[PDB]
């Protein structure tokens, strides 16, 4: 993969996540434990991740191969499933994003 070429493969999968409204909204910026009133968040989630950080990394050439991008998308979902209760709104939003991602990322992975 070459840098332009990688963005063209991965960006549609990231746009598909941003397109989910309202489900993507809580993921469009880093979790802010003090704004939200969840000060234990960083005690549970060691390595935070969100759509704005993934987008910045993709735009600036920080991913060289699809697996590195996939790792950060996974990490964003895994953190939200770890911290939030299974019947909570944010957990269900996370699951919807993950279902979209599973579909959108598959053609990229099958091409490798
Ligand atoms: C990714 O967002 C979370 O994990 C959140 C946890 N509680 C929240 C309340 C409002 C918005 C986001 C979150």
PDB file of C-alpha atoms and ligand atoms in Angstrom:
ATOM      1  CA  UNK A   1       0.000   0.000   0.000  1.00  0.00           C
ATOM      2  CA  UNK A   2       1.034   3.594  -0.819  1.00  0.00           C
ATOM      3  CA  UNK A   3      -0.166   6.520   1.373  1.00  0.00           C
ATOM      4  CA  UNK A   4      -2.758   8.007  -1.010  1.00  0.00           C
ATOM      5  CA  UNK A   5      -3.891   4.498  -1.944  1.00  0.00           C
ATOM      6  CA  UNK A   6      -4.326   3.536   1.697  1.00  0.00           C
ATOM      7  CA  UNK A   7      -6.452   6.584   2.485  1.00  0.00           C
ATOM      8  CA  UNK A   8      -8.698   5.823  -0.504  1.00  0.00           C
ATOM      9  CA  UNK A   9      -9.287   2.277   0.769  1.00  0.00           C
ATOM     10  CA  UNK A  10      -9.836   3.135   4.429  1.00  0.00           C
ATOM     11  CA  UNK A  11     -11.591   6.507   4.322  1.00  0.00           C
ATOM     12  CA  UNK A  12     -14.934   5.142   3.038  1.00  0.00           C
ATOM     13  CA  UNK A  13     -15.055   2.788   6.037  1.00  0.00           C
ATOM     14  CA  UNK A  14     -14.471   5.701   8.417  1.00  0.00           C
ATOM     15  CA  UNK A  15     -17.065   7.853   6.648  1.00  0.00           C
ATOM     16  CA  UNK A  16     -19.579   5.026   7.051  1.00  0.00           C
ATOM     17  CA  UNK A  17     -19.080   5.265  10.815  1.00  0.00           C
ATOM     18  CA  UNK A  18     -19.411   9.064  10.902  1.00  0.00           C
ATOM     19  CA  UNK A  19     -22.610   8.750   8.821  1.00  0.00           C
ATOM     20  CA  UNK A  20     -24.384   6.953  11.698  1.00  0.00           C
ATOM     21  CA  UNK A  21     -26.414   9.623  13.493  1.00  0.00           C
ATOM     22  CA  UNK A  22     -26.980   9.552  16.414  1.00  0.00           C
ATOM     23  CA  UNK A  23     -24.858   6.459  17.009  1.00  0.00           C
ATOM     24  CA  UNK A  24     -21.490   8.013  16.123  1.00  0.00           C
ATOM     25  CA  UNK A  25     -21.936  11.166  18.107  1.00  0.00           C
ATOM     26  CA  UNK A  26     -20.566  10.069  21.451  1.00  0.00           C
ATOM     27  CA  UNK A  27     -17.504   8.759  19.524  1.00  0.00           C
ATOM     28  CA  UNK A  28     -16.699  11.921  17.511  1.00  0.00           C
ATOM     29  CA  UNK A  29     -14.337  13.327  20.192  1.00  0.00           C
ATOM     30  CA  UNK A  30     -12.359  11.838  23.096  1.00  0.00           C
ATOM     31  CA  UNK A  31     -14.288  10.779  26.179  1.00  0.00           C
ATOM     32  CA  UNK A  32     -14.094  13.646  28.707  1.00  0.00           C
ATOM     33  CA  UNK A  33     -14.563  12.043  32.158  1.00  0.00           C
ATOM     34  CA  UNK A  34     -14.901  15.354  33.994  1.00  0.00           C
ATOM     35  CA  UNK A  35     -17.544  16.754  31.605  1.00  0.00           C
ATOM     36  CA  UNK A  36     -19.479  13.509  31.749  1.00  0.00           C
ATOM     37  CA  UNK A  37     -19.172  12.859  35.482  1.00  0.00           C
ATOM     38  CA  UNK A  38     -17.362   9.503  35.167  1.00  0.00           C
ATOM     39  CA  UNK A  39     -14.006  10.204  36.861  1.00  0.00           C
ATOM     40  CA  UNK A  40     -13.093   6.496  37.058  1.00  0.00           C
ATOM     41  CA  UNK A  41     -13.041   6.223  33.247  1.00  0.00           C
ATOM     42  CA  UNK A  42      -9.237   6.353  32.788  1.00  0.00           C
ATOM     43  CA  UNK A  43      -8.778   3.854  35.642  1.00  0.00           C
ATOM     44  CA  UNK A  44     -10.686   1.294  33.544  1.00  0.00           C
ATOM     45  CA  UNK A  45      -9.840   2.407  29.986  1.00  0.00           C
ATOM     46  CA  UNK A  46      -6.029   2.605  29.779  1.00  0.00           C
ATOM     47  CA  UNK A  47      -5.746   3.574  26.083  1.00  0.00           C
ATOM     48  CA  UNK A  48      -8.597   5.839  24.910  1.00  0.00           C
ATOM     49  CA  UNK A  49      -9.578   6.073  21.249  1.00  0.00           C
ATOM     50  CA  UNK A  50     -12.240   7.880  19.220  1.00  0.00           C
ATOM     51  CA  UNK A  51     -13.230   8.814  15.674  1.00  0.00           C
ATOM     52  CA  UNK A  52     -11.490  12.206  15.696  1.00  0.00           C
ATOM     53  CA  UNK A  53      -8.174  10.609  16.692  1.00  0.00           C
ATOM     54  CA  UNK A  54      -8.526   7.866  14.065  1.00  0.00           C
ATOM     55  CA  UNK A  55      -9.348  10.516  11.433  1.00  0.00           C
ATOM     56  CA  UNK A  56      -6.352  12.660  12.381  1.00  0.00           C
ATOM     57  CA  UNK A  57      -4.044   9.625  12.257  1.00  0.00           C
ATOM     58  CA  UNK A  58      -5.379   8.530   8.860  1.00  0.00           C
ATOM     59  CA  UNK A  59      -5.111  12.050   7.389  1.00  0.00           C
ATOM     60  CA  UNK A  60      -1.529  12.524   8.633  1.00  0.00           C
ATOM     61  CA  UNK A  61      -0.184   9.234   7.320  1.00  0.00           C
ATOM     62  CA  UNK A  62       0.179   7.442  10.653  1.00  0.00           C
ATOM     63  CA  UNK A  63      -1.206   4.155   9.299  1.00  0.00           C
ATOM     64  CA  UNK A  64       0.888   2.202   6.802  1.00  0.00           C
ATOM     65  CA  UNK A  65      -1.283  -0.925   6.445  1.00  0.00           C
ATOM     66  CA  UNK A  66      -4.981  -1.642   7.056  1.00  0.00           C
ATOM     67  CA  UNK A  67      -4.328  -3.681  10.236  1.00  0.00           C
ATOM     68  CA  UNK A  68      -3.016  -0.616  12.080  1.00  0.00           C
ATOM     69  CA  UNK A  69      -6.172   1.351  11.306  1.00  0.00           C
ATOM     70  CA  UNK A  70      -8.367  -1.643  12.195  1.00  0.00           C
ATOM     71  CA  UNK A  71      -6.557  -1.909  15.550  1.00  0.00           C
ATOM     72  CA  UNK A  72      -7.594   1.634  16.508  1.00  0.00           C
ATOM     73  CA  UNK A  73     -11.223   1.141  15.366  1.00  0.00           C
ATOM     74  CA  UNK A  74     -11.344  -2.042  17.467  1.00  0.00           C
ATOM     75  CA  UNK A  75      -9.838  -0.213  20.438  1.00  0.00           C
ATOM     76  CA  UNK A  76     -12.522   2.481  20.314  1.00  0.00           C
ATOM     77  CA  UNK A  77     -15.269  -0.173  20.345  1.00  0.00           C
ATOM     78  CA  UNK A  78     -13.566  -2.404  22.932  1.00  0.00           C
ATOM     79  CA  UNK A  79     -13.182   0.539  25.341  1.00  0.00           C
ATOM     80  CA  UNK A  80     -16.866   1.435  25.057  1.00  0.00           C
ATOM     81  CA  UNK A  81     -18.026  -2.163  25.560  1.00  0.00           C
ATOM     82  CA  UNK A  82     -15.642  -2.484  28.539  1.00  0.00           C
ATOM     83  CA  UNK A  83     -16.717   0.677  30.366  1.00  0.00           C
ATOM     84  CA  UNK A  84     -20.442   0.860  29.587  1.00  0.00           C
ATOM     85  CA  UNK A  85     -23.169  -1.542  30.683  1.00  0.00           C
ATOM     86  CA  UNK A  86     -24.615  -3.881  28.063  1.00  0.00           C
ATOM     87  CA  UNK A  87     -28.088  -2.339  28.330  1.00  0.00           C
ATOM     88  CA  UNK A  88     -26.807   1.244  28.096  1.00  0.00           C
ATOM     89  CA  UNK A  89     -27.359   3.644  25.196  1.00  0.00           C
ATOM     90  CA  UNK A  90     -23.643   4.091  24.480  1.00  0.00           C
ATOM     91  CA  UNK A  91     -23.003   0.332  24.467  1.00  0.00           C
ATOM     92  CA  UNK A  92     -25.821  -0.184  21.950  1.00  0.00           C
ATOM     93  CA  UNK A  93     -24.527   2.695  19.805  1.00  0.00           C
ATOM     94  CA  UNK A  94     -21.100   1.028  19.880  1.00  0.00           C
ATOM     95  CA  UNK A  95     -22.607  -2.256  18.697  1.00  0.00           C
ATOM     96  CA  UNK A  96     -24.310  -0.494  15.794  1.00  0.00           C
ATOM     97  CA  UNK A  97     -21.022   1.122  14.735  1.00  0.00           C
ATOM     98  CA  UNK A  98     -19.278  -2.255  14.977  1.00  0.00           C
ATOM     99  CA  UNK A  99     -21.885  -3.897  12.727  1.00  0.00           C
ATOM    100  CA  UNK A 100     -21.386  -1.175  10.115  1.00  0.00           C
ATOM    101  CA  UNK A 101     -17.597  -1.519  10.403  1.00  0.00           C
ATOM    102  CA  UNK A 102     -17.697  -5.324   9.969  1.00  0.00           C
ATOM    103  CA  UNK A 103     -19.462  -4.843   6.635  1.00  0.00           C
ATOM    104  CA  UNK A 104     -17.440  -1.902   5.334  1.00  0.00           C
ATOM    105  CA  UNK A 105     -13.965  -3.192   6.219  1.00  0.00           C
ATOM    106  CA  UNK A 106     -14.435  -6.648   4.702  1.00  0.00           C
ATOM    107  CA  UNK A 107     -13.696  -5.742   1.024  1.00  0.00           C
ATOM    108  CA  UNK A 108     -10.471  -4.053   2.123  1.00  0.00           C
ATOM    109  CA  UNK A 109      -9.361  -7.121   4.053  1.00  0.00           C
ATOM    110  CA  UNK A 110     -10.344  -9.559   1.282  1.00  0.00           C
ATOM    111  CA  UNK A 111      -8.092  -7.671  -1.164  1.00  0.00           C
ATOM    112  CA  UNK A 112      -4.891  -8.327   0.827  1.00  0.00           C
TER     113      UNK A 112
HETATM  114  C1  LIG B   1     -17.495   6.545  24.049  1.00  0.00           C
HETATM  115  O1  LIG B   1     -18.310   7.183  25.066  1.00  0.00           O
HETATM  116  C2  LIG B   1     -18.396   6.543  26.227  1.00  0.00           C
HETATM  117  O2  LIG B   1     -17.808   5.521  26.466  1.00  0.00           O
HETATM  118  C3  LIG B   1     -19.322   7.216  27.169  1.00  0.00           C
HETATM  119  C4  LIG B   1     -19.611   6.784  28.439  1.00  0.00           C
HETATM  120  N1  LIG B   1     -20.597   7.560  28.991  1.00  0.00           N
HETATM  121  C5  LIG B   1     -20.967   8.525  28.083  1.00  0.00           C
HETATM  122  C6  LIG B   1     -21.936   9.520  28.176  1.00  0.00           C
HETATM  123  C7  LIG B   1     -22.120  10.365  27.096  1.00  0.00           C
HETATM  124  C8  LIG B   1     -21.346  10.233  25.951  1.00  0.00           C
HETATM  125  C9  LIG B   1     -20.380   9.239  25.858  1.00  0.00           C
HETATM  126  C10 LIG B   1     -20.186   8.363  26.922  1.00  0.00           C
END
